[PDB]
């Protein structure tokens, strides 16, 4: 009665608050809305779906799984083909993060299949990107970052992302393109198709620069740096690694300053400028002191000592070694 009205109102404050960067409050409003309760089952189910998504973004995958599973069940109750496909996708993506790869696959496939039956091309592209991500995580998860199931999972992600790119091109979805170019690039990378990794990551660059997505932009320079190292072109990687270090400064991200610092530190180890590693790995040990990742200070000390052993300063290297001995 008066509740089926205060429920939806309470949902909107939950909804609004999550687009505004505060899901931690919006959840409380979603949870409040559920306490009150409506009797329109598509409305309650939609609240479950948003509780699920809000907990996803907040990193409570456990309670996220629980809410998407509820929304899915209601969808089957109600017979809402389209609700069921979206809840299947969300279950899928949640299970993927939990490492329930095999069930992730079935759920994303259910999302895709219904999307296709309905001739929903937006749903089909989203379902395709989700299925790709599952295969991609499945293969990335195996071992250290041999088994033929790895190659086969990764190859399956390549086909899925390429299928997705083809659909979101046709739909004009520049942001979807960038996301598929990045995951596709990183998949080609793990397969040893480095020439194809560069091609995809250059598309992600362009689209990130276009949107002004300055986090994505450095993301691609770094990923580009990775791929040139394995290509053996260490000077290009250095070029790309520096570019990442700059965007880290303006972003005021002392973290990716360091990761970019250590990595171009390690890159010139292959180029004999042990100073660039020194000058960087000291910025590494400094910022890692700031964030208590001093663990890497020993990694910097282990790399700095070994640049030193090729290049003098034996007493400074033993001091680095002495600190590395700290753990």
């Amino acid at each position: 009665g008066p509740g089926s009205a205060s429920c939806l109102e309470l949902a909107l404050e939950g909804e609004r608050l999550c687009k505004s960067g505060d899901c931690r409050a919006g959840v409380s409003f979603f949870e409040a809305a559920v306490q009150v309760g409506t009797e329109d089952l598509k409305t309650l189910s939609a609240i479950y779906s948003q509780l699920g998504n809000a907990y996803f973004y907040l990193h409570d995958y456990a309670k996220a799984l629980e809410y998407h599973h509820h929304d899915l069940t209601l969808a089957r109750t109600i017979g809402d083909q389209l609700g069921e496909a979206k809840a299947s996708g969300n279950l899928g993506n949640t299970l993927k993060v939990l490492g329930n790869f095999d069930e992730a696959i079935v759920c994303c496939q259910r999302h895709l299949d219904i999307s296709r039956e309905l001739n929903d091309k937006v749903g089909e592209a989203r379902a395709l990107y989700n299925l790709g991500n599952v295969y991609h995580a499945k293969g990335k998860s195996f071992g250290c970052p041999f088994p033929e199931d790895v190659r086969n999972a990764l190859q399956a992600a390549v086909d899925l992302y390429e299928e997705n790119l083809s659909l979101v091109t046709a739909l004009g979805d520049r942001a979807a393109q960038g996301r598929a170019f990045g995951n596709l690039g990183n998949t080609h990378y793990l397969l040893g198709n480095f020439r194809d990794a560069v091609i995809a990551h250059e598309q992600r660059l362009l689209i990130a620069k276009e949107f002004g997505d300055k986090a994505a932009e450095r993301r691609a320079y770094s990923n580009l740096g990775n791929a040139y190292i394995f290509l053996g072109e260490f000077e290009t990687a250095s070029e790309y690694y520096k570019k990442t270090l700059l965007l880290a400064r303006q972003l005021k991200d002392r973290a990716v300053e360091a990761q970019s610092c250590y990595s171009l530190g390690n890159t010139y180890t292959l180029l004999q400028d042990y100073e660039k590693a020194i000058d960087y790995h000291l910025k590494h040990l400094a910022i890692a002191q700031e964030l208590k990742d001093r663990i890497g200070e020993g990694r910097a000390c282990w790399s700095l000592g070994n640049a030193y052993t090729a290049l003098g300063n034996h007493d400074q290297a033993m001091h680095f070694a002495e600190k590395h001995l700290e753990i």
Partner: peptide, 15 residues
């Protein structure tokens, strides 16, 4: 290797 975000389906609130 820095990936791309996952993208969930949103099921907005009906009137």
């Amino acid at each position: 290797p820095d990936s791309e975000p996952d993208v969930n389906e949103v099921r907005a609130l009906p009137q």
